[PDB]
Symmetry: C2
Subunit: 321 residues, 2 copies
């Protein structure tokens, strides 16, 4: 019934329509999976289709890999508006085409009404790893710079504020974008990249916590150097949110030796949402500050003090992606 | 919060806990994805965990491939019974271990109550293709035997009959099982395998239709040679169902040249549910019968006549897998 798929995704790997798709790929590969439950489904600056491609493209690249192939799996609600599914799949085609990535295989389940809320999408990405060693949450080390690709809090703020009918500044919108090309350039052109990660789940603070944890170092962050859009700042205090824990869908943390840091910003500025790319701190070894412990993230505040950025709260906030 | 995952799946590829998992795989690969919405979640002979591993292992093998890695993505309902999630993940570990397959990466989304019905699972499998050329729905050709791995209708009948509190024969239960080892042996030991496929969506008739369609041949089936358990026969007429269109979760259609057919049954008999493995017909070229058209499936009935097995009806029957 629903075959807008070839009308938006078409390629000879998908259009062979077997139980599995055949892939030609070299050796060491990166694999990643995500499900997408964002509510609502259309919002300023993107949609579930948009997240579904972009976020999985990103997850694959975080291993310093070139994403080549996506697979994808819809769970749709009975009597769901077909125009909606049409728009979402069109979002996906464009995003895939835009990122150089082919959706090669899929599935589609339909469920009675009530059983699911309109639709959900899982996508699974596969790509080829470009370097040895490759970026990894446990490879942050004493003397590395911590860089951010762009502003924090945008995505989370915009769907939290849509879901309450509030509009705020017109310039508050999702940052859903593919960062494969930036990563590709980082790893092959700047080199010796230690950690790549995108602050999606629980925002910058908590992914900084996972890195600090995995590497057994501390992360040092400078509040002022963390770019946050003024309207996102204002949106966040109106609704009582910390933008450093809000989800981002189009951003990346990059952590590498000091020597290569300035060159990695160059690239990052030319990346999506890269106007605001910045060095936000450094990685220091246990007790180097000190007192601050291994697994801990400490921010020098704007006011000349300190703040421990602690892990979530806070099971989550629901359905932001 | 939910980390029974390492308590049931644990391996160093998953237990590195990055945005993506690193995989070491050779060249030509098979990839497949499925979402699992079966209702109810526990039934005689398997569960959603069970389908989730087994059915994706199967889908990958249908390309004559060795499945190596699964990724997996839960969508769970808020306040869902943790014992349930515990049982389902334990099902998955066992099934993965049992099939020689590692769950290497995952995701987990939680949604408010109402937004989804208890839980859903997508899994995506990846494996290495064992032969050139490889089995493919368009490779059925004049003079091939059509073989079945086992009895038809079992899975569909059992969850349709659970969902109505009915019990029927104790020997009616899901056939959820991994058929990677059978396939592996078929392709490397019997050889020149033309088509592999598992009659899941809409049962044997409709997957026979997809093959007949893709190959541009007719499929000839012999009703009596199609194994159906007596209690499944009786369960099916009580509830007004055609067992040849009921979903199967542990079965496979194998289509190959006549010369290798007897040797492929040997293997098939030693396969799961292989007691009943049988030759059910042959593949004939347009007009060879004739009148019967390309894309068509014609059965010689038990009573000495003919029946055209037509494509579904019949959007589906909901949530059988």
């Amino acid at each position: 019934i629903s075959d807008l798929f070839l009308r938006h995704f078409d390629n000879p790997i998908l259009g062979t329509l077997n139980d599995a798709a055949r892939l030609d790929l070299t050796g060491p590969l990166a694999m990643s999976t995500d499900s997408y439950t964002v509510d609502p489904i259309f919002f300023p600056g993107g949609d579930i289709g948009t997240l579904a491609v972009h976020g999985t493209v990103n997850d694959v690249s975080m291993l310093g890999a070139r994403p080549r192939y996506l697979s994808c799996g819809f769970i749709l609600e009975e009597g769901l508006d077909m125009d909606i599914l049409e728009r979402v799949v069109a979002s996906m085609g464009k995003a895939a085409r835009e990122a150089g990535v082919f959706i090669v295989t899929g599935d589609t389940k339909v469920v009675p009404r009530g059983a699911c809320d309109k639709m959900f999408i899982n996508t699974t990405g596969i790509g080829e790893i470009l370097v040895d060693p490759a970026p990894s949450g446990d490879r942050a080390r004493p003397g590395d710079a911590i860089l951010i690709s762009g502003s924090m809090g945008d995505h989370g703020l915009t769907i939290l504020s849509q879901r309450q009918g509030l509009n705020f500044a017109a310039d508050v919108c999702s940052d859903s974008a593919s960062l494969n090309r930036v990563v590709e350039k980082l790893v092959l052109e700047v080199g010796d990249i230690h950690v790549l990660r995108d602050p999606t789940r629980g925002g910058l603070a908590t992914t900084l916590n996972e890195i600090a944890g995995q590497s057994q170092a501390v992360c040092h962050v400078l509040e002022t150097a963390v770019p946050v859009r003024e309207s996102v700042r204002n949106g966040c205090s109106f609704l009582g949110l910390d933008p450093l824990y809000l989800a981002n869908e189009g951003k990346l943390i990059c952590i590498l030796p000091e020597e290569r840091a300035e060159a990695a910003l160059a690239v990052l500025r030319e990346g999506p949402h890269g106007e605001h790319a910045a060095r936000i701190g450094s990685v220091k070894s246990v007790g180097e500050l000190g007192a601050a412990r291994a697994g801990q993230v400490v921010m020098e505040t704007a006011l000349g003090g300190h703040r421990l950025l602690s892990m979530l709260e806070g099971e989550q906030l629901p359905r932001i992606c």
